[PDB]
Design a binder for this molecule. Structure first.
Ligand SMILES: NC(=O)[C@H](Cc1ccccc1)C[N+](=O)[O-]
Ligand SMILES: [Ca+2]
Ligand SMILES: [Ca+2]
Ligand SMILES: [Ca+2]
Ligand SMILES: [Ca+2]
Ligand SMILES: [Zn+2]
Length: 316
């Protein structure tokens, strides 16, 4: 809507206080005019009709429990926007400052979040398996990253191309989490997953097998469930990315780590200049090797590490 940019204050899902960019016009709306063509957060009101209504607030204070999911969805979308802009010189997900829209309070007890091709959608969780999912910065960045992928590589969401699609979202969701630098780690969704259990997560990049996901090509899922295992086989790529960045010896193969920043540079380049809708794991290895080559040279440690990483997970 048309109005004047203001700054509200509230509390996120984890009870943390933060300032959020709003817009005043009779009501204070969750509309951030400071980033690109704006970041808009809507209320789904426990239903499934999207996007719902632009979040309206009477006094610009967002401390109600009902407000929490909206506060985080709005704030973290901003952090993710900043990541892509400041780190990769990318303006919003389409590269041309497209408006970023999110809807919270989607359905009832909905234990998931997703990008529907046009916007972000967050369930509140059932309070047992999940709490409002927008509370996890890695979850928010993961979902927004799907928008980036859809506008760039366009990886088909099934089988190996789908597994890469998932991994790219886990990778950048994690890199964004490290960017915000608040309790960063290589796990996925630990901040909003099972409030009753300590130290677990939905997925692990450092050790996919911890939650039953493959950490080597020889253990890939070939069934039809989960669109051919996109959330399962993603572990193979997640492990490789973890190794490229942190290094280590996996199944007897040693990898020299090069750090998170270079991991991000290599994968961002592969995603935006080499990967295609039908790219498979072997093709991802080639894209990453070529990306590292462009960025650091064919004889660089970076290129050697990318090769070791994929060798370690059995991807040739
Ligand atoms: N099915 C899920 O739980 C996934 C949603 C999710 C993704 C990242 C973190 C937490 C939840 C599907 N996905 O990755 O789009
Ligand atoms: Ca209020
Ligand atoms: Ca964390
Ligand atoms: Ca995490
Ligand atoms: Ca937990
Ligand atoms: Zn995903």
């Amino acid at each position: 809507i048309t109005g004047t940019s203001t700054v509200g204050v509230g509390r996120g899902v984890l009870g943390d206080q933060k300032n959020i960019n709003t817009t005043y016009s009779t009501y204070y709306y969750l509309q951030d005019n400071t980033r690109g063509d704006g970041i808009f957060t809507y209320d789904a009101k426990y239903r499934t009709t999207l996007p719902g209504s632009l979040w309206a607030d009477a006094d610009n204070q967002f401390f109600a429990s009902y407000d929490a999911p909206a506060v985080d969805a709005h704030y973290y979308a901003g952090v993710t926007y900043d990541y892509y802009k400041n780190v990769h010189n990318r303006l919003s997900y389409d590269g041309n400052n497209a408006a970023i829209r999110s809807s919270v309070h989607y359905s009832q007890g909905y234990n998931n979040a997703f990008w529907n091709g046009s916007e972000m959608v967050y369930g509140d969780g059932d309070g047992q398996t999940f709490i409002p999912l927008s509370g996890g910065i890695d979850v928010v960045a993961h979902e927004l990253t799907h928008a980036v992928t859809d506008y760039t590589a366009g990886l088909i969401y099934q089988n190996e191309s789908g597994a890469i699609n998932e991994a790219i979202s886990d990778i950048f969701g994690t890199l964004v989490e490290f960017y915000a630098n608040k309790n960063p780690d290589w796990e996925i969704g630990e901040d909003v997953y099972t409030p009753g259990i300590s130290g677990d997560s939905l997925r692990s990049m450092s050790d996919p097998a911890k939650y039953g996901d493959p950490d080597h090509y020889s253990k890939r899922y070939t069934g039809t469930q989960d669109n051919g295992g996109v959330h399962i086989n993603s572990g193979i790529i997640n492990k490789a990315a973890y190794l490229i960045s942190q290094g280590g010896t996996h199944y007897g193969v040693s990898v020299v780590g090069i750090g998170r920043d270079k991991l991000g540079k290599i994968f961002y380049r592969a995603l935006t200049q080499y990967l295609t809708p039908t790219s498979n794991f072997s093709q991802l290895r080639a894209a990453a090797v070529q990306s590292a080559t462009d960025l650091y040279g064919s004889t660089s440690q970076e290129v050697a590490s990318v090769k070791q990483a994929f060798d370690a997970v059995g991807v040739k």
